[PDB]
Structure formats: structure tokens, C-alpha cells
Amino acid sequence: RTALSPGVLSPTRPVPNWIARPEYVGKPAAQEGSEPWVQTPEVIEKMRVAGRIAAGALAEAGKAVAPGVTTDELDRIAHEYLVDNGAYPSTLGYKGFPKSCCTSLNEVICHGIPDSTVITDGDIVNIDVTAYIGGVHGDTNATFPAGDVADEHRLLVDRTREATMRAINTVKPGRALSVIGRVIESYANRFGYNVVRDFTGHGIGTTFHNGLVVLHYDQPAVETIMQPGMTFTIEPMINLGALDYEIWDDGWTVVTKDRKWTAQFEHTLLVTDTGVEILTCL
Ligand SMILES: [Co+2]
Ligand SMILES: [Co+2]
Ligand SMILES: [K+]
């Protein structure tokens, strides 16, 4: 199977005009980066709805993953699930991004753009979709195997999922945030994988990336302590090869330099009074 190259982007999909757009839609930048890391009880409850809807759109698109299908089609299905449930797709028009989710096949680390690319037997594909509803965001992603995937790649996918869930089960108020990236990296290194460093989880609430940064590698210099009401993502990208990457001219698609495949999972999490709640479940 060759290295991917760009396919052709289908026309911008429309969303019902009654669905409220994030402020950043049709603007070159987003007004985000300085919002409180601990959300209000109101915002938390609204984020459960947004999380649930983003989890539904992810599951629907993942069901369509099969040799034969375009990435564009995965986007059509996610887009249509979000819209039928009253949500705006947060990626759509976010910093000029053209689609309603990110589709990252094989050696694409992240930020892949749904297009005419046809998925083949043995490929892996991450689908990352976010929902904006009631003024808040819910963000989730999963890598899905297509047909008959090599054992090397099923293991990568299974172990990326496992790293993410292990990190999720470390979340508790009063525990250092830096715990997350230590658990992830330590598990990935056990199988000789390398954790992408330059892309991170983020705080999320009324804004998409609110300024809080969640590292997926061991970085004990971070002093941030987890507090009840904090909402953020854990979304580690794990590479079979070297971390070195390139960005396509589209200004978005990140691909590994050696072309070895890479996988990712993502939940939106709430720090509760005693532990964690995953908001992006069905
Ligand atoms: Co995401
Ligand atoms: Co995210
Ligand atoms: K990938």
C-alpha cells in the first residue's frame, strides 16, 4: 500500500441556519485561550449533551469504515448525524478548516481532511469529530480498522486505546495533570512505540481549545493540579516509527516522515469530586 497523497475536497456542506455557529465561524482565528479551566455546573450539564452527540456521530461514521469508502463519505455521515441532532460540527470553519471532522488514515498523525481518498483493505483510519450545542463543545476520536488489518496495526490500535483508557483512569482531583502523559508514555514505550509530543489534549468548554494543554508524554515540569469541574481531552497519538513529520500544502494534514502508521483515541473528560467521568459516551 503506497503513501497517501491528497484527494479532491467535495463542496462545503451546509448546516441548518437555525443551528448556532461558534463565534469563530468565517473568521481567520478563534476567540479562545483564556477561558476558565473549571467549568460551571451549567456548562458541565450542557457538555454531557454535547459529548453524547459527538460520541454518536463518531460511532455512526465508524460504522461506515470499510474498504471501498471515501473519507469524504465518513464526513458526510458524521456531519449529518451532528446536524440531525441540532449540533454544529465544531471543526467546520474552525481556523478555515473545510470539513466537519478529521479523517487520518495510516501514516497521517492527525488533521487529515475528508476527501476523495478511497480506503483499502488493511488500512486504519482515525475519525475525530466535535459537536457544538448549547454554547459548548464535546470532542472525541477513535481509530477504526478497514477489512483485514496486519497484526502489527491491530496491536498498535488496541494499545493506543488502552493507553488512553489507562490515562483516563488516573484522572482525579488533587492528582498532578502530568500523571496522564507519564502513564501514556510508559505504556507506549513498553511496546517500543513513540508518543507524539507536538500535539496535545486541551481544555474544552464554551471554547474548543481553551488554553489548558494536556501532554501525552512524561513532563513532570508541569505543575497544574487537577480540580473538580475541570474539563479537558486526552487524545494521544502513538507512532510505530519516528516522531519526525511533514505538513501537506493544505496546511492541515500531518504525515509521518518515514510513512510508518500511527494511531489515536480521544475522550472529553470531567474531573469529578472524587475521580473522572467520560462525557463522550453514547
Ligand atoms: Co478531537
Ligand atoms: Co481534542
Ligand atoms: K493514522
Curated annotation (Swiss-Prot):
One Pfam entry name: Peptidase_M24
Binding sites annotated in the UniProt record for a divalent metal cation 1: D128, D139, E266
Function: Removes the N-terminal methionine from nascent proteins. The N-terminal methionine is often cleaved when the second residue in the primary sequence is small and uncharged (Met-Ala-, Cys, Gly, Pro, Ser, Thr, or Val). Requires deformylation of the N(alpha)-formylated initiator methionine before it can be hydrolyzed.
Entry keyword set: Aminopeptidase, Hydrolase, Metal-binding, Protease
CDD domains per the UniProt record, alphabetical: MetAP1
The name this protein goes by in its record: Methionine aminopeptidase 2
Catalytic activity from the UniProt record: Release of N-terminal amino acids, preferentially methionine, from peptides and arylamides
Cofactor section: Co(2+); Zn(2+); Mn(2+); Fe(2+)
Keyword hit for Metal-binding: yes
Known partners and oligomeric status: Monomer.
PANTHER family: METHIONINE AMINOPEPTIDASE, METHIONINE AMINOPEPTIDASE 2
One GO BP: proteolysis
